[PDB]
Amino acid sequence: MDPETVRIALGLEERTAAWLTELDELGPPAEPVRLPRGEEARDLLRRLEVPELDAEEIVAAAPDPDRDPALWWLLERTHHAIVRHMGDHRAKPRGGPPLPYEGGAAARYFHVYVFLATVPAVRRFHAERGIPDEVGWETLTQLGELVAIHRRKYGQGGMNMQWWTTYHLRGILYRLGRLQFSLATGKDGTPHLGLAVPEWGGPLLPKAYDESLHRARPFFDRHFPEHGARVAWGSSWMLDPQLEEYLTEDSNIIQLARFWTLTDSAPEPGNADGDSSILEFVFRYNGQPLDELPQRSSLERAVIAHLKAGRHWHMRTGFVKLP
Amino acid sequence: XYXXXYX
Ligand SMILES: CC(C)(COP(=O)(O)OP(=O)(O)OC[C@H]1O[C@@H](n2cnc3c(N)ncnc32)[C@H](O)[C@@H]1OP(=O)(O)O)[C@@H](O)C(=O)NCCC(=O)NCCS
Ligand SMILES: *[C@@H]1O[C@H](CO)[C@@H](O)[C@H](O)[C@H]1NC(=O)CCCCCCCCC
Ligand SMILES: *[C@@H]1O[C@H](CO)[C@@H](O)[C@H](O)[C@H]1NC(C)=O
Ligand SMILES: *[C@H]1O[C@H](CO)[C@@H](O)[C@H](O)[C@@H]1O
């Protein structure tokens, strides 16, 4: 097949043409793409913490080279486009476009198939680096969280955070307890660890946060000794000192943000950029009326209140030294 | 905002 046939068969927008040309250029992978099927697929899905409802739908819809030629073409090349940057944190996180949902269940779960097809390669990379199996698996289980989030947000099965899963699947991000850490590099090339907070795993308790921070240096110094970070960096709505207006002293976010040193300048108050970030993470916001959103927790009330008052939330950046 | 990165 060719890029233009695939693009048109799948209903992909004309801006995706360059990507599809790039995958055409790259060609199929050396190791042919294999999807697990049946109880093999069910065991892998369950290991990756995908909810039973979605897993079952994922196995039922698994695409086929003959009936789904355009999709299969994209599956192999997208897979290939990921593994060619295995271990490489300097490459951009390009997961490929989401597929129009008129293609059905195989279109909705496309990036789940990419992920399952790529598990053996990253697990090989884990083994080569001496990563413990439990760390490897614990890292990959965010697939389940991201599948569950799609269903919460949109009401049907899917996974549209494929740009993010390129980190897990390139073996550059690891979950080490409550927090994740990725191999990263500043503008001037200086190594650091990117810190991320997955949704699953309960509150960000100071003790769980501090255990994770203690794990980072020894993990990366052992398995990626060439990297050499001393500092974790984060950008997050969680670092917005404006939260202090609304949350109490028992708040885990308020308590923990006090150890962080912000390195960006105070944002312009009219800057409405962090607005969509906080709405995504607190509500998984999808276009709906604001007073229509829940108000169960102090943070849910805070986010709406501040926005109603005509004010804005900002994503702030800062660092903490690795213990 | 609402897209990801990081570039
Ligand atoms: C990160 C997270 C686990 C922290 O939760 P936490 O430890 O409970 O945070 P706090 O202790 O500050 O919570 C303060 C209040 O806000 C509520 N709250 C915290 N996070 C919330 C969220 N995502 N949605 C709704 N309410 C939340 C808490 O229940 C608490 O309510 P209460 O005062 O009414 O009891 C949580 O916000 C979360 O899961 N977020 C999704 C992932 C995320 O945002 N990651 C960072 C991306 S950059
Ligand atoms: C970035 O977005 C992806 C897409 O959903 C998420 O999966 C990640 O969790 C997001 N990153 C974020 O967590 C950065 C948090 C660093 C903040 C450090 C402050 C911690 C103490 C308050
Ligand atoms: C995003 O990439 C930039 C630099 O390329 C880096 O500063 C930041 O830590 C990265 N984020 C993650 C989570 O890797
Ligand atoms: C940030 O800029 C990059 C540059 O390619 C885009 O891919 C992305 O959509 C965002 O605008």
Residues A77 and A115 occupy one common structural domain: yes
CA proximity to A315, closest of A270, A284, A285, A271 = A271
Cβ atoms of A107 and A158 within 8 Å: the answer is: no
Residue A294: C-alpha distances to residues A68, A167, A204, A209 (Å): 41, 32, 21, 27
Clarify whether residues A20 and A123 are in a common domain.
Answer: yes
Same domain, A137 and A214: no
Solved by what technique?
Answer: X-ray
A123, A153, A172 — which closes off a domain?
A172
Q: Are residues A199 and A158 in the same domain?
A: no
Q: A198 and A140 in one domain?
A: no
Resolution in A: 2.2
Q: Does residue A146 belong to the interface with chain B, where contact is any CB pair within 8 Å?
A: no
User: Are A276 and A251 in the same domain?
Assistant: yes
**Claim to verify: residue A193 and residue A221 sit in the same structural domain:** yes
Residue indicated by tokens 């009401």: A155
CATH code: domain of residue A234: 3.40.630.120
Domain check: are A214 and A319 in the same one?
Answer: yes
Our mutation pick for probing the ligand 4 site, out of B3, B4, B7, counting the most ligand atoms within 8 A of Cβ, is: B7
Using CB atoms, which residue from A92, A93, A280 is nearest to B2?
A280
CA–CA separation, A61 and A193 (whole Å): 38
Query: What's the domain range around A128?
Result: 1-172
Q: Which pair of structure tokens corresponds to residue A39?
A: 């109880």
Task: Find out whether A46 and A38 touch, Cβ atoms under 8 Å.
Answer: no
Question: How many domains in chain A?
Answer: 2
Whether residues A107 and A213 share a domain: the answer is no
Residue of A167, A277, A307, A312 to mutate for B, most B C-beta atoms under 10 A: A277
End position of a domain, from candidates A154, A172, A190: A172
Neighbours of A46 (CB within 10 A): 14
Nearest-neighbour CA in chain A from B1: distance (Å):
5
Q: Which of A130, A150, A172 is the last residue of a domain?
A: A172
Do A154 and A52 lie in one domain? The reply is yes
A182 annotated as a binding-site residue: yes
Same structural domain, A152 and A248 = no
Length of chain B: 7
The DSSP secondary structure of A18-82, one letter per residue, reads HHHHHHHHH-S-SSPP----HHHHHHHHHHTT--HHHHHHHHHH---TTTSHHHHHHHHHHHHHH
Indicate if ligand 2 lies below 6 Å from the C-beta of A247: no
Distance from CA of B3 to the nearest CA of A (A): 9
How far, in Å, CA of A295 to CA of A297, rounded? 6
Asked if A285 and A279 touch (Cβ cutoff 8 Å), the reply is yes
Q: Could you tell me which of A297, A206, A198 has the C-alpha nearest to residue A256?
A: A206
Rounded distance between C-alpha atoms, residue A175 and residue A191, angstroms? 18
- How far is residue A114's CA from residue A136's CA, in Å, rounded to a whole number? 18
CA distances from A250 to A29, A207, A235, A287, A297 (A): 51, 14, 22, 31, 13
| A230 CB-side CA count, 13 A | 1
